[PDB]
């Protein structure tokens, strides 16, 4: 059924980079290039969506999810490499979605005069106490996670709704903080880039790319939904069409409404803003110096609480339940510890992904963590888009998930050169890893 | 016989970067790091020497040379990729060794007041008229090229000999040009780096690496020498031991003898030089601004004429005679034109390597051309050092060319990460090329 695969994907790709960093990305690269970031990051994942819909099309592989169907259709050589890369990418994405949860709690406790230890040392405290109570949800409560998640999405569509219903209001006491209407003087200004002290185009692309990346969570269940052949193809390619048309409609709206670099004080007019207020260049309540812009009705603070905890919970249950099936096929013999669990729940893999999330959570900057999430998600999407081409050349019958051609090769080049433009010495290292884990698997005795 | 395989290798690796750029390299990176450049560039080619000696060890493949023995021992999948990479690297190295021939002719015609067109536009003229009279040697005269080359090497060992016999002389009228004896004040100064406006360690490594790279020219004949199994292993690994102990003995001698940044005029003493002369920082006859240092007896100008023409002639006869056998196995069907010739001489491949040399010769800077020679020579040595490991894992019997272990893998990593530190977007492109030319060959019907 589509309504249990579209929700689990559309709720996973609406994450942390929608409210608290998309204004920063449309502030750095303007409007005309940020929409190009949306379109390039949605081409590079709609080719992967076509490919992972063509994977789930061929056979009646009902058991397992997102590892049982990409391994038994494409061979253990690619299936053992993707089963480590994607299971590590979900182990670090949970650290990303929790530092994004913590830095909007400490910046809400900065209001009303609350300081725990320091400015960014309390991010480590809240990120410590968040993951240990996400393990309490991941271990025990599974009936309350799959059920009652539409209530965890309708309070996110209300957060989109009051945001759009608030940016048409006047709010005359809010224009010192940069808020305005829809004037042409502010759209014509925000159309070009004003790149900051170090950020370039591919830098803000690396920051943005984890906002369009959880599309395999729809296909990450197949022993749970009925008729998995029909559902996966249209509930993955339709969540992308909703989410990209929400990202463009938010980036163009918040770009044509709030002016960059404007502080909040008493000022008057009587040639950049050309409006009733005037500011200085060499700000705190601006559009490029604070990360949380809000029209009105502050349940956007609740709209974070359902956009970052839900996508972190869906990437904490999903890394050891892939890594367990990887260690059950016994492809890598050094990892054979991580298959014994307590209802087939791996509790000794939860400790491993807890240590990985706790290691990558102690660095308390989201703009440092997001490129090394966008590294491994491209290093798994390139392996999917290339392994389907390699099965198309070393003849697996695709059975038409609306496009299963050899244009996926073009989606495996764009996941490769863009992964090297962003931090080339970390793409070299992961391609040496995924070539060594290919040669080790193809030349072993089994 | 060793005396016809050691000469053809030792004369090919003594090339352009010995007299006219090794002083610049020991001037940039000092003495203590330039010897590390020698040692790293000789480790990364002695692993390749062990590997290409283990290739020539297995069978009695008497016909052909350096393509017949690396293809029929390692398979057409690696043999068709190395047969293009190495045959293009020799097609651009002939442009390198002729711009190095031309810029020491125009800097000798700058003395005695001769200007043809401009300062570096006459390099293009002399490089144009040099390659067209190297094609006259390559096509017609082959008996005078193989015979009478010891006379083309003894006038190079005389150029080393009078250089060493000249740097012990006083030459009191030459010390304004920076020449001195062997003082401790000049050795202690030249021990550390004084990197220029853009050059780093791997930049001067990229400049130096074509000085230690023609070691496959010994194994590039096997239908010409008797008993090729015995000779190749010890005439390749012994030319490297001579040439590295000449490079170190030249770099430490010219580094401890001539001071950097000293102009030639009338000066006197009465704390950098601490000698009888004194100069200013903000030079023409110095050690880092002129490329040709000379002790005495100017037949070093003849010592260029046998070090750069001989190594360019040996890389003009060797690119189409590899590419012809590649186009005779008909692995790549689009290249099937380049096999018909006039005594089996390919004349329509000479036109192709003439156009490649003429294309890369019109850029008249040696420091631009040398990194894109050191790119493709590392991209062929990595494929040799990895294809021997891949035949060691996909079981070809090595028969002990004194080391044929799986340490060659370590020589295929060091040819890979150092090829990416130098100009990463040109190593990415050539690894996509050599992976596409692997997948095209392994999945074709034959
Ligand atoms: C940097 C350029 C791409 C790097 C490639 C990383 C590792 C990919 C592994 C795929 C190799 C498989 C090729 C076909 C092998 C076969 O035919 O058996
Ligand atoms: C042209 C390619 C050069 C780059 C080399 C990439 C890294 C190769 C690593 C391969 C490791 C193979 C390990 C095999 C272990 C075993 O067989 O037990
Ligand atoms: C950038 C990292 C290394 C890139 C390697 C480029 C391609 C050279 C090796 C080709 C793949 C060889 C794998 C052999 C596996 C098999 O066929 O069994
Ligand atoms: C790990 C993925 C990296 C992607 C790198 C892919 C490099 C390009 C491969 C091109 C293969 C072309 C095969 C041609 C097939 C044919 O024409 O028969």
Numbering used by the authors:
A (entry chain A), B (entry chain B): 287 to 556, 573 to 584, 586 to 645, 648 to 700, 704 to 754
Reproduce passages from the article.
Cation-chloride cotransporters (CCC) are central to the regulation of intracellular Cl− concentration and have key physiological roles in neuronal excitability, trans-epithelial salt and water movement, and regulation of cell volume. The CCCs are strictly electroneutral transporters, NKCCs transporting two Cl− ions coupled to the movement of one Na+ and one K+, whereas NCC and KCC couple the movement of one Cl− ion and either Na+ or K+ respectively. All CCCs are feedback-regulated by the concentration of intracellular Cl−—this is mediated by the WNK (kinase with no lysine)-SPAK/OSR1 (SPS1-related proline/alanine-rich kinase/oxidative stress-responsive kinase 1) signaling pathway. Here, using single-particle cryo-electron microscopy (cryo-EM), we report the structures of human NKCC1 (hNKCC1a) and mouse KCC2 (mKCC2a) at 3.5 and 3.8 Å resolution, respectively.
The final model of hNKCC1 was primarily focused on the transmembrane and extracellular regions from the high-resolution map, although we were also able to determine the overall structure of hNKCC1 including the dimeric C termini from a medium resolution map. We have strong evidence that both of our structures represent inactive states. In the case of hNKCC1, we analyzed phosphorylation of the N terminus using a phospho-specific antibody—as shown in Supplementary Fig. 6a, there is no detectable phosphorylation of the protein as prepared for cryo-EM, and from extensive previous reports, we, therefore, know that this protein must be inactive. Like in DrNKCC140 and hKCC139, we note densities within the cleft at the dimer interface and we attribute these to four lipid molecules with lipid tails in the hydrophobic cavity contributed by TM residues, and hydrophilic heads facing intracellularly. In our inward-open structure of hNKCC1, extracellular access to the pore is blocked by the side chain carbonyl of E389 from TM3 interacting with the side chain amino group of R307 of TM1b and by L671 from TM10 —the narrowest open radius of this potential “gate” is ~1 Å. To test the importance of these residues we examined the transport activity of hNKCC1 mutants. Mutation of any of these residues resulted in Cl− transport activity that is <20% of wild-type activity, with changes in R307 and E389 being particularly impactful; on the other hand, mutagenesis of neighboring E670 has little effect on function. At the intracellular end of the inward-open pore, it is noteworthy that R358 from ICL1 interacts with D632 from adjacent TM8. The most populated Na+ binding site is defined by backbone carbonyls including L297, W300 in TM1, A610 in TM8, and hydroxyl oxygen atoms of S613 and S614 in TM8 —this site (S1) accounts for 40.6% of TM domain Na+ binding sites in the simulation data.
